Amino acid sequence: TPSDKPVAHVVANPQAEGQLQWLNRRANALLANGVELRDNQLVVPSEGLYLIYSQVLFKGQGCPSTHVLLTHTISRIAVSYQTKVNLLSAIKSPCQRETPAKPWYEPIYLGGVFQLEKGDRLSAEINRPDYLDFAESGQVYFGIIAL
Amino acid sequence: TPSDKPVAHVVANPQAEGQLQWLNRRANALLANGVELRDNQLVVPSEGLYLIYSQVLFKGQGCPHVLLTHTISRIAVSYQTKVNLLSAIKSPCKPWYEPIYLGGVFQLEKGDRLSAEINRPDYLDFAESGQVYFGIIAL
Amino acid sequence: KPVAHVVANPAEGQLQWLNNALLANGVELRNQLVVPSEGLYLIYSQVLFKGQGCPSTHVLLTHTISRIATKVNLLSAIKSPCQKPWYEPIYLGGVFQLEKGDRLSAEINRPDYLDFASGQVYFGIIAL
Numbered sequence: 191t192p193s194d195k196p197v198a199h200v201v202a203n204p205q206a207e208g209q210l211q212w213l214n215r216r217a218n219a220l221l222a223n224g225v226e227l228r229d230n231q232l233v234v235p236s237e238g239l240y241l242i243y244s245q246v247l248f249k250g251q252g253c254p255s256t257h258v259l260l261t262h263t264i265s266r267i268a269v270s271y272q273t274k275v276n277l278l279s280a281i282k283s284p285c286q287r288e289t290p291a292k293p294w295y296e297p298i299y300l301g302g303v304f305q306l307e308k309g310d311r312l313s314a315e316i317n318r319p320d321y322l323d324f325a326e327s328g329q330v331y332f333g334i335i336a337l
Numbered sequence: 338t339p340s341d342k343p344v345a346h347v348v349a350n351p352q353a354e355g356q357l358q359w360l361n362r363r364a365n366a367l368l369a370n371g372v373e374l375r376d377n378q379l380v381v382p383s384e385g386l387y388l389i390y391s392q393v394l395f396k397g398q399g400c401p402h403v404l405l406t407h408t409i410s411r412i413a414v415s416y417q418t419k420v421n422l423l424s425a426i427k428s429p430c431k432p433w434y435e436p437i438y439l440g441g442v443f444q445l446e447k448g449d450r451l452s453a454e455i456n457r458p459d460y461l462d463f464a465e466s467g468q469v470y471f472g473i474i475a476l
Numbered sequence: 477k478p479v480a481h482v483v484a485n486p487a488e489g490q491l492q493w494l495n496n497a498l499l500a501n502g503v504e505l506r507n508q509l510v511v512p513s514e515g516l517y518l519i520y521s522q523v524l525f526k527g528q529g530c531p532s533t534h535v536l537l538t539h540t541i542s543r544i545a546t547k548v549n550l551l552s553a554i555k556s557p558c559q560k561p562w563y564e565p566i567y568l569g570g571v572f573q574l575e576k577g578d579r580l581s582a583e584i585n586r587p588d589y590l591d592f593a594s595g596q597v598y599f600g601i602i603a604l
């Protein structure tokens with residue numbers, strides 16, 4: 191007997207270099223029990239507590255002249271207040287000292303439990319899609335699990 | 338168990354050399370309701386949604402470049418191919434510590450094999466119990 | 477189905493668990509969650525550490541979930557935030573066969589670095 195628990199696990203489209211497009215129409219990606227993926231956002235089918243999680247992986251070849259700041263943020267767009275409200279956020283400075291060139295890898299993980307309402311849209315965005323590494327699978331993803 | 342939900346929680350062997358070997362015959366480790374541990378891989382007993390998870394803890398003394406990887410893979414029985422479900426790559430560089438937790442929900446089939454590997458077993462840390470583990474929970 | 481999801485009390489200089497929190501179907505909060513019936517449980521948690529700059533003494537941040545049936549680590553991790561403000565969360569989660577009456581604790585070593593202002597500081601169990 192399958193679970194009736196709203197769950198989703200969507201992955202970065204590896205073809206869309208220079209963008210962060212979430213896919214459920216990809217191997218080992220899913221939407222279950224009412225969760226929808228609409229306009230790059232997960233739509234919550236019913237109210238309740240949910241675990242929200244996401245990982246992005248950033249990669250760079252050395253350290254450039256201008257300082258790099260990498261951000262990943264998970265936003266909620268409620269039906270009654272249709273503006274992005276941050277739930278989870280994290281910032282990283284991959285290069286402490288600039289190159290006076292070794293590849294660096296910086297994962298950003300976000301996860302937490304939030305009360306969500308029916309129709310809430312969830313966004314998961316980065317500031318630098320040009321640094322995102324999603325060629326190999328399993329590195330960039332975004333999911334929910336209803337408690 | 339009375340729930341009958343296939344579950345597993347396996348732990349790393351601290352005295353395994355140059356490898357990340359999983360064990361179920363340890364305290365606070367288990368294989369229940371059909372899940373098997375065969376060739377260092379977890380074997381799924383039935384089709385369904387599963388929470389799949391793993392934690393590794395790396396540790397180094399100072400900074401000498403080092404790349405750390407941690408990957409959960411799936412070998413689907415119909416396909417016979419090994420693909421990453423969850424993967425992290427980190428460049429860590431006094432002692433430094435790097436925990437890596439990989440978790441998510443996946444549709445799995447009967448007979449799928451799941452693996453949890455790393456590139457640097459020599460950087461693993463086993464100072465305390467509960468620092469290196471791998472598991473699944475059927476929804 | 478015995479379930480529990482407690483949050484931290486923002487209680488100073490400590491990690492006190494309290495009841496978006498919920499306690500139900502036998503799971504009591506005696507500072508440990510007490511297991512009402514023998515079975516399989518997913519036990520999870522997250523803590524969030526934060527600081528400004530790096531001190532002279534090397535700081536190691538730990539978060540551990542223990543089982544008391546003796547005190548044994550079930551889930552544990554360590555973070556070294558200093559090899560500018562910083563934030564370091566620690567996530568734990570796994571499935572465990574527990575006995576009726578067992579106690580489960582979720583502790584940190586450095587509550588002075590805990591962030592008391594989020595959906596990232598919690599401790600919970602779900603009977604499967």
Ligand SMILES: CC(C)(O)c1ncc(-c2nc3c(cc2F)nc2n3[C@@H]3CN(C2)C(=O)c2ccccc23)cn1
Nearest residue numbers: 241243301337388440441474520521522567568569
């Ligand atoms: C449906 C099922 C199997 O009963 C179930 N119920 C609840 C959860 C649950 N897991 C949590 C959590 C809050 C939760 F309610 N907070 C954490 N976890 C674990 C570890 N860690 C922190 C993570 O960040 C994480 C990242 C992906 C995946 C699981 C985790 C997971 N699975």
